[PDB]
A = this chain, B = another copy of it.
Amino acid sequence: AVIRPDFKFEDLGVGGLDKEFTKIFRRAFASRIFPPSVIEKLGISHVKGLLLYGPPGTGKTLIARKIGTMLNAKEPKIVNGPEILSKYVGSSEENIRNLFKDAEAEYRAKGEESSLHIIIFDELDSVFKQRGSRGDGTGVGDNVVNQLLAKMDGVDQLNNILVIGMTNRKDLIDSALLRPGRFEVQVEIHLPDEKGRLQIFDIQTKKMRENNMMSDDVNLAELAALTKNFSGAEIEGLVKSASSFAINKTVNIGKGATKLNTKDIAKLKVTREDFLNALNDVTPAFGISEEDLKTCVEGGMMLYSERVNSILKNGARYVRQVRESDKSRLVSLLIHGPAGSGKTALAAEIALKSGFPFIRLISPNELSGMSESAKIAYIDNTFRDAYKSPLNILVIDSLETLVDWVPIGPRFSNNILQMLKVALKRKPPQDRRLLIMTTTSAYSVLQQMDILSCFDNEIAVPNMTNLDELNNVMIESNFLDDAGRVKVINELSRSCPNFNVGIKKTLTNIETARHDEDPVNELVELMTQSA
């Protein structure tokens, strides 16, 4: 009738998109399950138009390909976009109205008993662009829209036709076709989640695992964890790229001649490191984040003192609070202290430990080179993006630099400042939560801006002063031997007991002294001038 009696959808290649399959089935073919008598008794018309769309490489073509064999359907008629057009006058139009004869003849022939005829237009946007483009030329690029529109709207009671049009960009489609009676239902296909990711890996590696061609070492769960933003196509590319490494161990291409170890051909087997190399090869095209924060803490922590621990505990407390309560849908925090003491690393570390679904940072680094309007738009889009996921953490870096402060005017960009002022007080949409951490080094300037009133709590980060903490960082850095680390501190105790540097400068000085002369005469010397 309309679905084969022998089918369950488990066997099919498409995996990871199951909700979408149920929506399509419910809203498209559901009305053609019962006997016809019911539908007219209920006064419901059938659906006629479908639209599928998503980013490039998401699997839509796979669906369009397999659905015909999937549901006991008449062999769908496939036409790619730019072939409808033709040279001779009137040829394109007749070509469009040359597809519908068979279904319409069956309709006149057999009334409502007529079977379902499905035609799918790959690449809908190619020809059916906006019909008000202009150009003063050959009008074949418009009458085609008119022809399809006439045969689809003024159908003359043809109620046994479903057109499925697939595209990558809805925006280019002529608006005249997006209206009731004409492509009513639109289904978005977006990037897969993690579980569907695992499904895709499993589907891809079926034939591999069956033929004992993969080493038992390989663990799919780890791989699925690693591939943050990979679509199905990228996953397949990964699979075959990883395979190429295993392939290229027996056949030594270029070097030497063709040396095929006929024995190892039967012992061919893929291993984890090959997959890792493959991961290094392919890259995603979406990215967004989860790399900038990681590189922002590359130098790592040292826990030279309790202060670090206390601050971290407070951050853990706050993330717990925003995670638990439902009345607290927005919290803002300030992190202020002396320049170079190290602020950014701490906030990045807290955010990384939080493990929320959603994380990004905003830094002057990204915004560099843009015009003011571009910067405003960028920040606005970033914020609007943040209002999406159920839980969100946002980090703002070096606020003073974002506002272009120089003290001689004093000159600064007011627009950005006031935009930020309004934005940091905006509660997100209903049943969403947000957590803001902003860092600065010029507390007093902010106080003059009088913008101190939208911060719920402030955190100081005093730089270190006691020689013990210096010994801690020095032992961690492995600058010298044990006796060296002792003698230097004994010398520094009397050379200059009062001590105020920070953290970054210390590591810099350690490295320089390592390079030239790791004796006292360099490290202690510089340490003394800096303080």
Contact = CB atoms under 8 A, between A and B. Distances in A.
B80 A87 contact: no
A61 B137 contact: no
Interface in A295-338: 317, 321, 324-325, 327-328
Interface in A19-39: 21-22, 25-27, 29-31, 33-35, 38
A89 B136 contact: yes
A244 B123 contact: no
A155 B321 contact: no
A109 interface: no
Interface string A110-138: 00000000001011001101011101111
B42 A213 contact: yes
Nearest to A25: B253
A511 B327 contact: yes
A74 interface: no
* Copies of this chain held together in the complex: 3
B247 A30 contact: yes
Given A38-B268, A257-B7, A82 B126 contact: no
A388 interface: no
Given A80-B150, A240-B44, A265 B34 contact: yes
Given A237-B184, A512-B321, A247 B34 contact: yes
Interface of A: 3, 5-9, 21-22, 25-27, 29-31, 33-35, 38, 41-45, 47, 56-57, 61, 64-65, 68, 78, 80-83, 85-93, 97, 120, 122-123, 126-127, 129, 131-133, 135-143, 146-147, 149-151, 153-156, 168-169, 172, 175-176, 178-181, 184, 207-208, 211, 213, 233-234, 236-237, 239-241, 243-244, 247-248, 251, 253-258, 260, 265, 268, 281-282, 285, 317, 321, 324-325, 327-328, 364-365, 368-369, 376-377, 380, 401, 404, 406, 408, 410-411, 414, 417-419, 421-423, 511-512, 515-516
26 contacts: A8-B255, A30-B247, A34-B260, A45-B240, A65-B155, A68-B155, A78-B154, A80-B154, A81-B146, A83-B93, A85-B89, A89-B140, A123-B146, A126-B142, A127-B143, A129-B139, A137-B137, A168-B176, A178-B285, A368-B419, A369-B376, A369-B419, A401-B422, A404-B414, A406-B414, A406-B417
Report, nearest first, the 5 A-B pairs whose CB atoms are least far apart: A5-B257, A180-B237, A43-B207, A135-B139, A126-B146
